[PDB]
Amino acid sequence: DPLPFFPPLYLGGPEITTENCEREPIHIPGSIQPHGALLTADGHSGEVLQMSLNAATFLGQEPTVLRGQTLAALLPEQWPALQAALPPGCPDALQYRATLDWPAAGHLSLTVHRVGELLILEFEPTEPHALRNAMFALESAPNLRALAEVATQTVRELTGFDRVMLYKFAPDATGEVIAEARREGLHAFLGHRFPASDIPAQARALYTRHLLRLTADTRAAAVPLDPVLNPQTNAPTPLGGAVLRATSPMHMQYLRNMGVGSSLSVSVVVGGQLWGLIACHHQTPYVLPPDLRTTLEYLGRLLSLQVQVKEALEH
Amino acid sequence: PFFPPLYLGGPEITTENCEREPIHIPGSIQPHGALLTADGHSGEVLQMSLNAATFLGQEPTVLRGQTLAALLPEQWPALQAALPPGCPDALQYRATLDWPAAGHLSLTVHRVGELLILEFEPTEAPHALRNAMFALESAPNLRALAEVATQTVRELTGFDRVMLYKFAPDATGEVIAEARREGLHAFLGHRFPASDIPAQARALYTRHLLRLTADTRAAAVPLDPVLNPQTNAPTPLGGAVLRATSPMHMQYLRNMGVGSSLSVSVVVGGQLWGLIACHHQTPYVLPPDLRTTLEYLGRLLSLQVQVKEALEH
Numbered sequence: 001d002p003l004p005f006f007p008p009l010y011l012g013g014p015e016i017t018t019e020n021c022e023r024e025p026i027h028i029p030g031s032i033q034p035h036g037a038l039l040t041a042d043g044h045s046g047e048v049l050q051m052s053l054n055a056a057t058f059l060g061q062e063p064t065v066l067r068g069q070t071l072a073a074l075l076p077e078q079w080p081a082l083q084a085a086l087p088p089g090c091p092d093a094l095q096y097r098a099t100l101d102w103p104a105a106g107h108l109s110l111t112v113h114r115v116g117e118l119l120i121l122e123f124e125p126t127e128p129h130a131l132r133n134a135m136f137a138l139e140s141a142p143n144l145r146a147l148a149e150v151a152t153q154t155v156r157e158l159t160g161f162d163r164v165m166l167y168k169f170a171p172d173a174t175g176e177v178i179a180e181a182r183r184e185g186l187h188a189f190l191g192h193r194f195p196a197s198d199i200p201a202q203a204r205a206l207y208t209r210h211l212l213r214l215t216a217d218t219r220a221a222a223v224p225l226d227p228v229l230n231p232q233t234n235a236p237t238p239l240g241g242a243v244l245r246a247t248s249p250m251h252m253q254y255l256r257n258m259g260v261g262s263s264l265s266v267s268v269v270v271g272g273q274l275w276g277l278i279a280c281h282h283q284t285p286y287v288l289p290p291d292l293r294t295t296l297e298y299l300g301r302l303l304s305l306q307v308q309v310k311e312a313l314e315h
Numbered sequence: 316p317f318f319p320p321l322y323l324g325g326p327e328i329t330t331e332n333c334e335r336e337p338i339h340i341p342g343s344i345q346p347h348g349a350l351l352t353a354d355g356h357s358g359e360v361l362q363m364s365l366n367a368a369t370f371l372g373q374e375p376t377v378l379r380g381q382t383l384a385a386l387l388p389e390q391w392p393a394l395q396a397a398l399p400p401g402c403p404d405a406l407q408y409r410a411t412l413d414w415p416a417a418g419h420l421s422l423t424v425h426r427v428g429e430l431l432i433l434e435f436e437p438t439e440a441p442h443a444l445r446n447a448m449f450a451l452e453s454a455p456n457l458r459a460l461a462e463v464a465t466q467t468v469r470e471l472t473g474f475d476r477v478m479l480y481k482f483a484p485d486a487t488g489e490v491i492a493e494a495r496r497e498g499l500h501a502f503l504g505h506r507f508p509a510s511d512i513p514a515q516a517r518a519l520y521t522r523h524l525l526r527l528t529a530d531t532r533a534a535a536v537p538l539d540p541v542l543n544p545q546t547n548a549p550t551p552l553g554g555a556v557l558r559a560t561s562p563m564h565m566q567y568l569r570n571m572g573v574g575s576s577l578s579v580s581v582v583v584g585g586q587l588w589g590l591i592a593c594h595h596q597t598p599y600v601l602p603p604d605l606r607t608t609l610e611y612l613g614r615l616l617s618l619q620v621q622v623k624e625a626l627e628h
């Protein structure tokens with residue numbers, strides 16, 4: 001039965017059990033994963049409102065100094081570019097990316113998107129023809145099976161992940177591993193099927209709009225935003241569009257129990273519906289840098305197109 | 316059918332026989348790169364472009380005996396695996412060579428039956444592609460998508476004119492969006508007859524998705540031999556971007572005052588929906604890595620055109 005979200009934990013909401021999965025408000029956890037930092041800022045003035053508690057250690061500045069400046073002063077070269085790329089009223093799915101040379105922290109990748117009157121800024125550390133070669137190989141795959149196999153093998157070669165799977169949704173939202181590339185010694189998931197509740201309906205809706213999410217370390221504690229609520233609204237900060245957003249504790253426990261230290265999945269979206277997932281596993285924690293993740297994002301789109309094409313060749 | 320090419324004493328093309336020019340088998344290439352053909356098994360260099368000596372820095376005869384194994388040691392096994400016998404002519408493999416004579420070359424290979432076609436071009440060596448991808452996806456409708464696409468391509472390439480050229484059901488074309496330098500004629504809103512892009516060109520563009528004329532006044536460079544030794548027949552060059560552009564179309568571009576031309580096919584439901592079409596007033600060799608960006612954009616636009624057309628119908 002579909003039911004509306006509970007309030008999050010920090011607003012006195014209940015703790016989540018197998019009974020009530022589909023009601024955890026997974027988009028507003030009030031916290032991020034510790035391998036990057038996040039700031040929120042007023043979309044018109046550029047006043048800095050919220051920051052992750054670890055921000056001082058990524059950005060090399062005291063909180064009170066950060067919060068006491070506008071983005072115009074903090075990001076003089078990027079602030080006008082942000083404002084042109086992310087105009088008021090734009091969708092929350094639109095992202096702008098730049099690379100910064102920050103004194104204390106080396107090269108940072110900056111990813112920005114806009115939710116209403118809020119700008120959300122994510123900072124992460126950042127670092128030949130493999131993509132072009134893959135694009136052509138995907139297109140020349142003769143059928144859906146060969147496409148799925150080429151796609152899994154390519155992603156594994158690009159990333160070094162212990163397991164890469166193509167997980168396909170059935171009409172009842174149960175899923176099935178239909179191809180996989182895996183490290184020697186791992187047991188096969190190929191052909192296995194999993195109940196529809198393994199990925200509940202508020203996740204599958206979110207995964208139709210925001211096409212890539214990750215858990216870099218399934219044992220890492222989440223880092224709170226400070227303050228936790230958006231001071232504009234005294235309400236929760238929407239983090240559904242932020243890759244740094246903390247993963248649901250229910251899901252991290254599901255993954256630890258499997259022996260997974262690192263998870264990542266790309267949505268494959270066909271005709272406006274979530275067709276399947278490129279799901280990857282690593283046994284140890286593992287951070288895939290932003291520019292490599294971009295390659296996977298591009299492959300997500302290519303695969304969406306090629307899945308349509310291969311399936312049309314099939315009636 | 317097709318007329319024989321000129322160099323096999325076929326008729327010269329007119330506007331009476333637009334549909335029958337054998338544009339895939341011109342026997343020549345554009346001079347900003349070099350092309351070798353080679354045997355699929357032996358790696359034996361069978362044809363070369365008369366300009367190969369320039370790019371490769373090799374005494375002419377040296378090449379036309381040697382083997383790819385010898386000539387490209389690191390690459391030759393990769394090719395063997397990447398382009399297995401029986402693969403499609405559409406499948407391409409690329410690498411960057413740090414080659415003694417020329418700082419860096421791009422190498423592009425595909426296979427047509429028993430022949431490997433190798434293309435060499437100068438090359439080199441950020442977020443504009445990722446930023447463009449998200450911009451295309453958040454365009455609210457087909458019109459805005461067209462506008463974003465043309466603007467994005469112009470910004471990435473510096474081309475004087477970028478258009479989105481959409482085919483009607485009878486292959487009548489329409490310029491539905493345009494991004495252009497100040498002080499050019501506007502082709503926005505104009506329609507053109509199907510015969511401007513003739514049927515044998517449209518079919519080839521459905522399979523091979525990017526072509527270009529780097530300089531509309533440059534002479535083609537012959538293949539030597541012109542005929543493939545294997546077959547004593549013309550080498551198919553339609554999957555080669557270095558292929559000499561039809562003189563009929565270079566005359567069409569010169570009369571327009573264009574010095575450089577590129578286009579990318581937008582393919583939807585197995586059919587040619589339209590073209591990203593670019594003009595430059597002067598000669599312009601777009602480097603391979605930037606062309607790759609446009610090739611990606613072509614696929615992304617193909618996806619988004621279907622998405623956007625579905626939310627009208």
Ligand SMILES: *C/C=C1/C(=C/c2[nH]c(/C=C3[NH+]=C(/C=C4\NC(=O)C(C=C)=C4C)C(C)=C\3CCC(=O)O)c(CCC(=O)O)c2C)NC(=O)[C@H]1C
Binds near residue numbers: 017020215247
């Ligand atoms: C009480 C609710 C439960 C629950 C919740 C839940 N699940 C997700 C998202 C995912 N679940 C996945 C499950 C699988 N991983 C595999 O490898 C296989 C099969 C071999 C399955 C079935 C996957 C892949 C996801 C997607 C994300 C990822 O790649 O890790 C969420 C949302 C997490 C988030 O975005 O923060 C939630 C809340 N899962 C259950 O099993 C029940 C107990």
Ligand SMILES: *C/C=C1/C(=C/c2[nH]c(/C=C3[NH+]=C(/C=C4\NC(=O)C(C=C)=C4C)C(C)=C\3CCC(=O)O)c(CCC(=O)O)c2C)NC(=O)[C@H]1C
Binds near residue numbers: 332527560
């Ligand atoms: C006797 C046949 C004629 C003919 C042949 C022909 N045309 C092409 C290819 C193209 N024609 C194009 C035409 C236009 N470009 C524009 O900007 C506009 C409108 C403002 C039009 C109508 C285009 C865009 C192409 C694609 C190639 C490109 O991007 O430049 C070919 C094929 C060329 C080749 O690949 O070798 C041929 C043989 N064109 C005529 O007009 C008639 C007289």
